[PDB]
Every structure is written in C-alpha cells, then in structure tokens.
C-alpha cells in the first residue's frame, strides 16, 4: 500500500537521512577552545619540564 515510508527503506532513511546526517552535525571542532587546550597540554606535561 502506497503510504508513509515504513518497514524497509524507512530504516534505510534512519541509517542515512537521520543517522548519517546526525553524525555530520557533530563537532568536528566542537569543544576545541584553543586556550583550554593549551591548559590541557600543560596538564599533559604534568610535574616535569618538556622539550
């Protein structure tokens, strides 16, 4: 019966138009505050000195 997308290709939709796009919206530079990162890498060094 011709109707709303369901059953089969609706899941295809879920795995592309929904899911694929959803992931495309994520970050890739999200959370990357330069200054906070500079702090983070200072923390990564820790108690020692670094070259």
């Amino acid at each position: 019966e011709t109707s709303e997308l369901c059953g089969g290709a609706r899941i295809c939709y879920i795995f592309h138009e929904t899911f694929g796009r959803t992931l495309e919206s994520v970050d890739p530079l999200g959370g990357l505050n330069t200054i906070d990162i500079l702090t983070a890498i200072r923390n990564a060094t820790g108690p020692r000195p670094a070259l």
Partner: protein, 46 residues
C-alpha cells in the same frame, strides 16, 4: 699499654658506626640525581 690499645679500638668503633651512615647518604645522593631530570637547568640548553 692496655689503655692505649683500648683507645684505638674505641676510635675505630666510632668510625665504623659513622661509616654506613655516610654510605646511606651517598647512595641517597645518587638516587636524588636519578629521581628527577631538570631540563630547565640553567646550564642545560640546546
């Protein structure tokens, strides 16, 4: 004479008492150098 030698014995006893103490210190001194490397040392640059 008996006193004389007794004196000597006591002296070396004292020396032996303080021996291992210094040994421990020297051991520690090396360990301290092993404990940490200062790459910010004033004479160390590259």
């Amino acid at each position: 004479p008996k006193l004389h030698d007794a004196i000597v014995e006591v002296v070396t006893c004292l020396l032996r008492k303080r021996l291992p103490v210094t040994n421990e210190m020297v051991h520690n001194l090396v360990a301290i150098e092993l404990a940490y490397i200062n790459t910010k040392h004033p004479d160390f640059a590259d």
